[PDB]
């Protein structure tokens, strides 16, 4: 892709004591047009994956495919795809790292940023981060393009440093998570009131919550706001 | 005599539905000198014999490593084995590179069939005249495989193949009860594999320089056993 044309905003997530959570709003932007509401983001693979993706919508559909392809081709003479020779979070990473830095270096990128969450085999949290350059690093809360910028610093007050990880509780990190995206909502022009979110839990599994909505919102005061300086009614 | 005349290439079958290339490539196999494979639950162990040209030259190799969890023994064509497990190598190294994964032992025995079942329906070329045992530990635990110039892969707890091979073949069926639960105890199990292919010599004793040894298990990377390595097993 030279140039994107219908795109998904910020992807954000965390780590916290016992898993990883992932959300991302249901919208397709055209430019300043927005113009597809139920747009779905988050991609689990397997129960133990969740791949969430920003960016050219078409670029993330080609994606999709190819993660349901590898689902398919681990299973082929696997007699324990479903068990210790499943996907693990960390070969999903490694393919889309591999093949993001393959197409940028063919001047043909996917024009994409990319998270992918979920829990390794041993119960560790995986949560790491590739885009259409293929740049990758990890980090106890990772957010992609607008979400960088605002959803970062509040998710950071929660996990700031590693040791805050096991201090952290499904609860705590969601709520966290939920007010980010009220956040981007109220500042990000290419947001969406609606969104997904996801929870991989080393012992629940995956919990996948479609059609949130961004409530409690704080508009009140805007009565109170007339003219821009001297304006008096 | 009839034979003769349906076994010119691997491309004909003869009037019984045989592919007689395929079964003249079973036989380059006793041209080589025994080696042996078996396991337990937590290790997987090769012992080879090698041979020296004269009392002037070196032996040849028989073992080889193909990844940290992963290595093979062979007998027959050498050149065969060479190609075969540099083809092994590419796919564990492909396998870590592209999905930071270690090649499964038992998808390294489906890829080495696949690639050796073409050479046996090709007119140009021949089946790959060479036998593989094949170790490793994966995620599923501890594996031996054979492999067969056909291309099929079998999943064994023992085997022997090469020259007199049957009295170390009959030897770890008959152990099979003991050394398939010599677990934690990795010298334990490379005794009852040296002792196997004891059973194989004619006229011939282990010795430093003939005998080669490899292992890999939990905790244990793909490790190669020569000369002085071994006496504590002679």
Same mark, same amino acid.
């Given at each position: 892709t030279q140039q994107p044309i219908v795109t998904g905003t910020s992807v954000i997530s965390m780590k916290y004591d016992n898993g990883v959570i992932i959300a991302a709003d249901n919208l397709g932007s055209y430019g300043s047009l927005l113009r597809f509401? /139920? %747009? $779905? #983001?988050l991609i689990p693979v397997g129960d133990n994956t969740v791949v969430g993706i920003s960016g050219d919508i078409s670029d993330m559909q080609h994606i999709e495919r190819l993660l349901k392809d590898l689902v398919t081709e681990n299973a082929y003479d696997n007699p324990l795809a479903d068990a210790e020779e499943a996907l693990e979070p960390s070969y999903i990473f490694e393919y889309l790292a591999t093949v993001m830095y393959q197409r940028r270096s063919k001047m043909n990128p996917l024009w994409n940023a990319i998270i992918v969450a979920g829990v390794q085999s041993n119960g560790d949290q995986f949560l790491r981060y590739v885009n259409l350059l293929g740049v990758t690093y990890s980090s106890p809360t990772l957010a992609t393009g607008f979400g960088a910028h605002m959803a970062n610093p509040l998710l950071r007050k929660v %996990?700031? #440093? $590693?040791?805050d990880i096991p201090k952290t509780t499904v609860q705590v990190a969601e709520e966290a998570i939920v007010n980010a995206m009220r956040v981007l909502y109220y500042r990000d022009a290419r947001s969406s009131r609606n969104f997904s979110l996801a929870i991989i839990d080393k012992n629940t599994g995956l919990t996948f919550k479609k059609n949130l909505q961004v409530e409690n919102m704080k508009w009140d005061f805007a009565k109170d706001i007339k003219g821009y300086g001297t304006q008096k009614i | 005599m009839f034979r003769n005349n349906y076994d010119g290439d691997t491309v004909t079958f003869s009037?019984? /539905? #045989?592919?007689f290339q395929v079964e003249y490539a079973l036989e380059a196999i006793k041209q080589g000198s025994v080696t042996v494979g078996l396991r337990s639950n937590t290790h997987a162990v090769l012992v080879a014999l090698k041979r020296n040209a004269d009392e002037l030259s070196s032996y040849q190799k028989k073992i080889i490593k193909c990844d940290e969890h992963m290595g093979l023994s062979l007998a027959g064509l050498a050149p065969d084995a060479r190609v075969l497990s540099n083809y092994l190598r590419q796919q564990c190294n492909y396998s870590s590179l592209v999905f930071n994964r270690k090649l499964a032992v038992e998808r390294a025995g489906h890829l080495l069939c696949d690639k050796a079942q073409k050479n046996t329906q090709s007119y140009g070329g021949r089946p790959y005249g060479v036998g593989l045992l094949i170790i490793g530990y994966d995620k599923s635990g501890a594996h031996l495989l054979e492999f067969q110039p056909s291309g099929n892969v079998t999943e064994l707890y023992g085997t022997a193949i090469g020259a007199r091979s049957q009295g170390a073949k009959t030897y770890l069926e008959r152990t099979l009860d003991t050394f398939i639960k010599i677990d934690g105890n990795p010298d334990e199990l490379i005794k009852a594999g040296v002792e196997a292919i004891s059973q194989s010599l004619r006229d011939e004793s282990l010795t430093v320089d003939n005998l080669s040894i490899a292992i890999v298990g939990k905790d244990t990377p793909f490790t190669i056993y020569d000369g002085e390595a071994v006496a504590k097993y002679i």
């Open positions: 509401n /139920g %747009v $779905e #983001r %996990v700031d #440093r $590693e040791s | 009037p019984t /539905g #045989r592919l």
